[PDB]
Structure formats: C-alpha cells, structure tokens
Amino acid sequence: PWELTILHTNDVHSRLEQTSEDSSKCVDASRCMGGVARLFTKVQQIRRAEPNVLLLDAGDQYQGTIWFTVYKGAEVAHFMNALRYDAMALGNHEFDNGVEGLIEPLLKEAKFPILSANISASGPLASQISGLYLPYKVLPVGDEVVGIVGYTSKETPFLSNPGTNLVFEDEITALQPEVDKLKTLNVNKIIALGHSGFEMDKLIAQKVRGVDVVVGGHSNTFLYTGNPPSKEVPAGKYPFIVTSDDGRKVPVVQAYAFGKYLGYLKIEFDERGNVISSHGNPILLDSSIPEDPSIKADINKWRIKLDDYSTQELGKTIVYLDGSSQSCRFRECNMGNLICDAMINNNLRHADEMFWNHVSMCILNGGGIRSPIDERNDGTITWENLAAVLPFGGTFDLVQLKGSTLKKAFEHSVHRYGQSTGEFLQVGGIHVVYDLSRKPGDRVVKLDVLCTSCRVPSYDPLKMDEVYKVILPNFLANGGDGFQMIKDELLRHDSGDQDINVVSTYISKMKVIYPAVEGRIKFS
Amino acid sequence: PWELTILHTNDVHSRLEQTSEDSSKCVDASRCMGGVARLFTKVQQIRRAEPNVLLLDAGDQYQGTIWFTVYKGAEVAHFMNALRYDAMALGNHEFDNGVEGLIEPLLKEAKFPILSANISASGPLASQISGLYLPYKVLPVGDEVVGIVGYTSKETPFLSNPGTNLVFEDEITALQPEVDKLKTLNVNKIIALGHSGFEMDKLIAQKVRGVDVVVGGHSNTFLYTGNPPSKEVPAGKYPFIVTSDDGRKVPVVQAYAFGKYLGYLKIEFDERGNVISSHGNPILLDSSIPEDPSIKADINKWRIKLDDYSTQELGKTIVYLDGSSQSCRFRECNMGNLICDAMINNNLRHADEMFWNHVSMCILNGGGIRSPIDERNDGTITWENLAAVLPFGGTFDLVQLKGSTLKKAFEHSVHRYGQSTGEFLQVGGIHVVYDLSRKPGDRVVKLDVLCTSCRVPSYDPLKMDEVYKVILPNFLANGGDGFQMIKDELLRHDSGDQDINVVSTYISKMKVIYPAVEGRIKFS
Numbered sequence A, B: 001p002w003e004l005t006i007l008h009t010n011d012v013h014s015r016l017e018q019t020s021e022d023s024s025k026c027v028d029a030s031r032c033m034g035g036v037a038r039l040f041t042k043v044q045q046i047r048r049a050e051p052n053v054l055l056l057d058a059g060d061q062y063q064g065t066i067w068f069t070v071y072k073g074a075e076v077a078h079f080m081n082a083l084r085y086d087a088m089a090l091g092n093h094e095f096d097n098g099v100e101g102l103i104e105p106l107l108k109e110a111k112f113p114i115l116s117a118n119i120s121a122s123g124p125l126a127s128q129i130s131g132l133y134l135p136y137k138v139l140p141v142g143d144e145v146v147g148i149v150g151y152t153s154k155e156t157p158f159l160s161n162p163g164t165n166l167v168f169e170d171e172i173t174a175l176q177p178e179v180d181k182l183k184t185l186n187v188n189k190i191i192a193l194g195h196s197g198f199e200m201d202k203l204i205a206q207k208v209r210g211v212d213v214v215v216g217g218h219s220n221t222f223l224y225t226g227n228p229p230s231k232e233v234p235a236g237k238y239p240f241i242v243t244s245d246d247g248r249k250v251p252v253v254q255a256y257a258f259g260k261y262l263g264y265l266k267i268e269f270d271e272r273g274n275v276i277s278s279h280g281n282p283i284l285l286d287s288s289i290p291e292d293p294s295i296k297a298d299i300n301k302w303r304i305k306l307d308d309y310s311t312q313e314l315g316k317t318i319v320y321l322d323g324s325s326q327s328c329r330f331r332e333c334n335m336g337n338l339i340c341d342a343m344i345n346n347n348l349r350h351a352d353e354m355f356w357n358h359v360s361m362c363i364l365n366g367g368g369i370r371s372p373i374d375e376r377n378d379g380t381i382t383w384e385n386l387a388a389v390l391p392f393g394g395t396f397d398l399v400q401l402k403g404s405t406l407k408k409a410f411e412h413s414v415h416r417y418g419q420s421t422g423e424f425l426q427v428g429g430i431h432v433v434y435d436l437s438r439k440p441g442d443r444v445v446k447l448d449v450l451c452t453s454c455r456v457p458s459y460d461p462l463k464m465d466e467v468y469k470v471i472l473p474n475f476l477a478n479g480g481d482g483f484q485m486i487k488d489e490l491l492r493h494d495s496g497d498q499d500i501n502v503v504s505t506y507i508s509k510m511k512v513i514y515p516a517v518e519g520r521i522k523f524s
C-alpha cells in the first residue's frame, strides 16, 4: 500500500502572525497559537518523518487583518511560497480586490498551482488569465502521481468582487468531466480541493465519481476524532466519511480557520488508486510548537510597513464619532450609523435587473463599539483609531433571517433596556420604533426595512415570513450577546470582511465623513 | 478737465457664450445676449471713440457653466487676456478650486494685475503667492496715472474654498492705509475695485478717504438712470452717489451679472484728481451688437472639449434616479434627496470648534427637477443627463431664514397639494410631517432640523425666532414658485455654485450612488 500524508489549511484569512485562542491579536505570547512561523516548524517536522506529503490550501488566504490591507496578497504569495505549499484552490475572498487583485499579487507570484475547475472567463479577460489558474494539476509524489482538482463557491459573486467577466459554474457539473479526463490519463489518485463549504464538500464526495478525498473550506468547519484539543466544538468526525454513489467510502476534511490548526490526513491507497484506509486529526498549533526563527524574523521585518500604515490618515471626520457606551447602548449613535453604512457599502455587489443591491440591511450590537473618535486631531482618522472602536478581530458577515427572527432580535435588543448592556442594536436600512412601557418581548411597535427588489430604495413594513439578507458581526451570527434566535433560525451564513478593514475602506472612499443621528431608532 | 471712461464687468460667472435673456443657454440666437465675443465688439468700438479707457472686472469670473467645469479658469485668463482687461479684483468664487486653482490657471496666466488689499497669507503659502495678486496697481492712462485698489468679501471663507492659510480682513480697515499710501506717492485718481456687495461698496465710498469711484460686484446689483432696457429692475440710479465723510460725492457702480451688460461710467477729474462729474449707464449687450467673428471662432474651437466632456461618465447609479413630477411634486423622491445631499456637500467649509459645518439644511422645489435618470445604461451618469434634470442654468445659493419664514415656506409647499404644482419641497437636513386634512397654512405638524452648533449632528424642533442657514435654488431665493416670504424675509443671500456642477461634483466624488427615499417627508 502507498501512503500519502495530506497536510491542509483553509480560511487562514491573513493570520500571518500568531493569534490569541479566539484568533484575535496575540496578547500573552506564551499562550498564542497559529501563525505561519509555527506552521513552518510543524510542516518541516512532518516532512522529515513522512515520505509522501502534500501541503494544500483550500482557499481564503485573502482578507482578515492589516497584513491583507497593506500587502494585498503579496504576503500570501511570499509566505505560502516559503512554506512550499504544493497547491491552493481559489476561495471567494481571493476575489475581494477584483480579478486584477488576484492576478497581481497572487497568480503571477505563487510558485505552486492555483486551482479552480468551475470558473470560466470571457472576452479579453479570458486571454489575460489563461493558464494562471488551472482546473487541476497532476503532481509527482515520490514515484507516483496525484491529481488535484479545484473548485470555488458558485456563490462567490454575492460574497466578493469577481466582476462581470467570470462565471462560477455548478461545482459537481464542472468537476465530473475533469475527474473523468484524469482517469483517461491514468491518474487513479484524485483529491478534490476547494472552497464551497462542508455541505457542498459532502455532495462532491457523494456524487463526483473518482474523487478519492475532499479537502474543503469556506464554512470554517472543525472536524475531530476524539476529545477536542481546544474550544472549537467538532461538527463531526475527522475525516467525515461519505458513502459515494459508486459505493466507496470518501473522506471529507476541513481544518477550522485562522491558521489555528494544521489538517493532517493519512491515506492508504492500493495499486489501482482505491482508498484502503484514512485516519488523522487536525493538529492544534499551540505554543508547545516553536515559531521557526527565520520565518518569525521575516514576519517581523514585514511588520514595519504595517506599523507605519497604522498611524497614517485614512480620511477625515468633521463630526465627533460618538462610540460611547452611554450613547450606543441606549439610542441611535452616529458611530453605529457610520459602521452600518460601511457594512452596506462593502456588500455592494453586481446586481440583476431584479434588485438595486442584493442586501440593504445591517445590525450591529452597541457593545461591539468600543471607543469614540474625536474630530479635533485636525479631523484625522487612522487605522489605530478604528482598532480602538473595533478591537475584537471579527468580520461583518452576510446572513439570511426570516422577518420573525429579526423582530425577535429587536425585542432581545431592548428586553432589559436601561442597564448599559451590549445587545442594543445599531442599524442601517432598518427603522425601528420601541415603546419601552410595553412588556419585554412586545416593545417593537414599528419595524420598517429598505427594499432590495426595487429600483428606488424605500422602506416597507417587515414581513414575518419573508427572508431578509442582513450584514452583522460574526459575534451575532454565532449567537453572541444572547442572540440565540439568530444562530438557531438563520437560513444562510457566509463570513465577510475584517471589521476594521470594512470601515477603513469606506472612510478612505468618502474622504470626509459627517454621520448624523437621524431617527433610524426611535422611542415612543 | 481729464475724462476717464471706466468700462466694467462683474459676476460674469462663466458666461463665455451668449445667453438667453435670463442668462441661461442661448436657444433663439437672434434674441441672445452677452458673451465675450459680443463684449469684444462693444469694448473695441468704445476704445476707438474715447481716449482714456480702463476695462475692469470686479471678480467672480469663476463658476457658472460647463466652461469652468472643464477649463477651470484657463478660459478666464485666455478670454480676459483677448479682451485686454486692465485689472481684475478677486471675487469669492475665484477660490472655488482652492488657492491652487487660483494660482494656476489665473494668477500665473493673466496679462493684467489681479487685486485684493484685504487678503493675507501665512506660512509657505505667503512665499508661494507673493506678488501674484497685489493690493493695488498704478496704471498709466494717456499722460496720467490711475491707482486701482482691490478688495474681496470678508465672508469668502463661508462662500468658497480658500483654505485655512488665507485671512480675509475687514475691507475698510485694509483699504484705508493703501489709499493713504497712494496719496503719498502722488496718485490723486483712485478707483476702488472689489467684490463685497453693493452695501459694502456704499460703506467704502462713504468711509475710505481718497476713493474717487467704487466699482463693485458680488450682489449682482443692477443700477440704471432712466427707463431700463431689459427685464432687470434697478436697485437705484447709475452711478449711485454716496456722500463721503469728507463731503465728496463718490459714484458707486455695478453691472448686474452674467455678462449681459457692459458697465460704462464717464468721470471728469480736475488737475488735483477731484471728481467734477460722473455719468453713464450699463450697455445691454443685445443681438444688435455683432459677435466679433475672431473671438466667436475661438469660442467655437474651445467648445469642442465641452461637447466631448458632456457625454463622459461622471459616475454610476445602481438605483433609478426618480426625478418624475408624479414623485417629486407629491412626496419625497430620491432625485430630490440626491440633489439636496449634493448641495450640502458643496457647502462644507472650514469649521470653528463652534459647528461641525456652518450649514446643514436644504430645500429644493420639485418643479425644478425636470427628468429622471435611468440606471440601465450600465449605471452611467453624464453631464448631459444632469442637464436634463437641471436645465434652467441656476445656482444653489446660501440664505439665512428665521424659523417662522421656513415654516411658512413648508406651508406654501402644500397649500394647494394634489395639483402637481412646482412648489412642493424636496429636502436635506430637514424632517417634515404634513397633515393634509388640516386647513392650508396649518398643515405642517412636525418640522425638525439638523443642528449646526453641535459636534454630533442630530435633529431638533425648528424654533420660530432662530435664524437658519439654508441652501436653495436662486429661483426660490428670488421668490419663485410663490415663495414671496423667502424673498421678503431673508436676512442674507449669497449666490452659490452652478446647479449641474454641484451635482456632477458630488457624483464624481461618490463614484457609485444609491439614494433612497427614507422618511425626510411624511404625511399623517
């Protein structure tokens, strides 16, 4: 039997440096985790011990910290090249800076193949990008070969900025003929590496004949066999076994997100490329693993430009930005309005004739707003200033919520009003009126929302059975601040852009801001 | 006696081409007026006939039409040079593109002196601008000399974009010592040429000892002796005689605006430079005066780049821009909101610690909105598109109105509601609620306005005795659409930027717009 060790990462999201346990800024170095210098140590150890190793990434290196803001993917090519990745699939966030921001910094500079079988280009773009990403690559591994076939979320156009010259095909439709072709070329060991989420990964394992292993991402899915090593709760066993339509057992793996874990799967193959066995587990990259000194020194050299950028003017405010708890946990606050307006601006994506934009609505817990910004520093706003407002290292995510769910969220917003608690919601594209004289759970007396399926945006009453797209912090999507109804009732969740980065981009675009308090939230 | 002919223009405001009677686009060429080619003909005729002629401009050549949008003052230097102006005073609108947009295109390229005695620079700007404008110039005229001393509105910082490195001094304070100095230099014939308005011009004539003649501007003041030649109603005789504090009779002149008239004043001086007599009248530049063919051919060559620019993309909309009468004469319309938001953005000026901005409020007659813009031309918005929305060649002016006046305007807005009449007001920085079941004059049931004297903009009830700054069309400032209360009760009026140009700049800054209908106007 021929044994292959698959090492894999996904959704690293710009965590070049080691992190806290929750993947935010490292504060207590002795308890920090992940980062590329530590990953290097572990990958190097494994490659000393195991003859046949592939190191794969299932996409979404782009977006997540100031590294991406400043280096715009140059850091991804540089550090993934230093770690000698063997292949990467395109994720949705690889399109955040458009096609041009993918071609240059990543596709031209990577020393490994970049894969996606389900993305096609037309017009001049097709000639410009031809061969810079591939449907698959056949890689030599010892005396054998392994085909790796890529895929990317069909939903990328709603979740990034790929432009109108790329088409994202159904994954299974695109993958089957490539896997078929590899069979005709005597490639009997096939890994599907891609970025569509655990649910699609299981359908691929089930339906794509000839796929031996699925290495996925996008859904930040933690899988584990045994007692978990940290705070992440497993969604299932590692690997997750799918029984394929042709009767095979196909392992499906993912490795959470943020470079906290290294995925590690050992596969035994027979001489015909059938999987005989698969086992493994992600490896927690905790402080017991040293950071590689050479990689760490290069990280610290690249950090200089980050420190320089963090104090540069992004733009100006002519108004006090009231991020005080005394405002933002009690009433509409102009910092809340600014951040929600930045969230909606970030989620402007290419529109059908069926909507002016796919999403119009925003909610933001006032407890997530951690500082005001004073306008009397000649109006300057810096990244450092925004990092005081938004210090948790979160994202602004896209969810789909029934109106009934959102009305329950707005009741939760004021259920214990008057105690300076974090759950009070700031808004965009929503007008709410509370009557605090009513019983908790019955305080919302008007709730109007900005239409999407309309040529002129206007407000209509919220409908209980309608499903709304809403931009909100990951903290709330995950049921933080007691918003269990959001976690338990949401119909869709996709992780979005770094919180600070969303606001910094909007302020840079606007150049001079003057957000008002304007009656998005009223009390009767 | 030594006779001087003073020819003068003021507030030409980018009317390079001949105009309609109302100074808008020329439609019936046989009835058109003004323009630089016609002015050239008349000035050339006068210079053949009169030995001692000065041609003066009292400022505000900048701003008014697409000429200024595209050529940014190069057209002013070029055509004023072709007409051989002898001197120009700086107006407020010469600062619309900042100090840099004055130095380059106008101060460096003009072949005549540019004057202002009451503007001082500090820091590096002082060295950069030194001598590029002057307090005064002594000009040879035949065998004599005439001193011309300039001045500019002290209010320029509220009415343009001069920046924080220029100080505008009290006119009379600055002028007196310059006029004194010219006396010590044996210059006994002194013209004050400047841009502060008729009321300040009369104070200058009264109080500045040694000024023989005041040639003014800014207030678009029409003065005439006799039966007026066109639709402009004279504010007084031409010249307007002020009795000075030293007992002299000092003529004060102005020549309306928009190049419609050439001011023409004949002064007789004795050998000591005392005015013995003054007489004249502005000359209506009507179609009986031919356009100079050489100037007209140069105008038509410069027009090519205007035509090219008029169809270029300024920016995009992802929403239908509803400028329909069925919306904008009956309820809040998103085109109205866009134009009002552009008006407020245009009037962001350098703020004290006493206000976030000096003005927060906007009203716009819905009858002044003349077209929608469809978003389905790939979202493109062109100048040509904006010219269909705003076809009247007006300005967005700054006024000061008591709250009582503004409440009366909002009653007038709905006095005969339901007939698709033009007076219905679109708004910015104002939230109004009507109850149309009430009697005309008593339909406004809530009227809240955005604060200025506040660090966080928020809405407060309108106060009847408070004076508010409001941006509004010149048509309304002048009492159009039956808004006689605005004309009759306003405390201040200053002419602002060209309507199309205000909106085009805002759309270019924003790049992608999506104005909503959001409850600025409601009905109970």
Ligand SMILES: Nc1nc2c(ncn2[C@@H]2O[C@H](COP(=O)(O)O)[C@@H](O)[C@H]2O)c(=O)[nH]1
Pocket (backbone or CB within 6 Å): A365, A366, A367, A368, A392, A394, A421, A422, A423, A473, A475, A481
């Ligand atoms: N986004 C986000 N907000 C958080 C997080 N932890 C706490 N919060 C917010 O901070 C509040 C607690 O703040 P105080 O300790 O200041 O009261 C919570 O109610 C919540 O609104 C986090 O990890 N992410």
Ligand SMILES: Nc1nc2c(ncn2[C@@H]2O[C@H](COP(=O)(O)O)[C@@H](O)[C@H]2O)c(=O)[nH]1
Pocket (backbone or CB within 6 Å): B365, B366, B367, B368, B392, B394, B421, B422, B423, B473, B475, B481
């Ligand atoms: N700004 C401005 N609006 C005007 C002018 N003349 C008319 N209007 C507007 O057009 C309306 C008349 O339009 P109708 O003819 O389309 O009904 C007036 O009520 C007024 O609102 C003008 O010279 N300038």
Ligand SMILES: [Ca+2]
Pocket (backbone or CB within 6 Å): A188, A189, A190, A210, A211, A212, A272, A273, A274, A275
């Ligand atoms: Ca196989």
Ligand SMILES: [Ca+2]
Pocket (backbone or CB within 6 Å): B188, B189, B190, B210, B211, B212, B272, B273, B274, B275
């Ligand atoms: Ca004199």
Ligand SMILES: [Zn+2]
Pocket (backbone or CB within 6 Å): A011, A013, A060, A091, A093, A218, A495
């Ligand atoms: Zn991701």
Ligand SMILES: [Zn+2]
Pocket (backbone or CB within 6 Å): A060, A091, A092, A093, A195, A217, A218, A219
């Ligand atoms: Zn993803």
Ligand SMILES: [Zn+2]
Pocket (backbone or CB within 6 Å): B011, B013, B060, B091, B093, B218, B495
């Ligand atoms: Zn003017």
Ligand SMILES: [Zn+2]
Pocket (backbone or CB within 6 Å): B060, B091, B092, B093, B195, B217, B218, B219
């Ligand atoms: Zn002026």
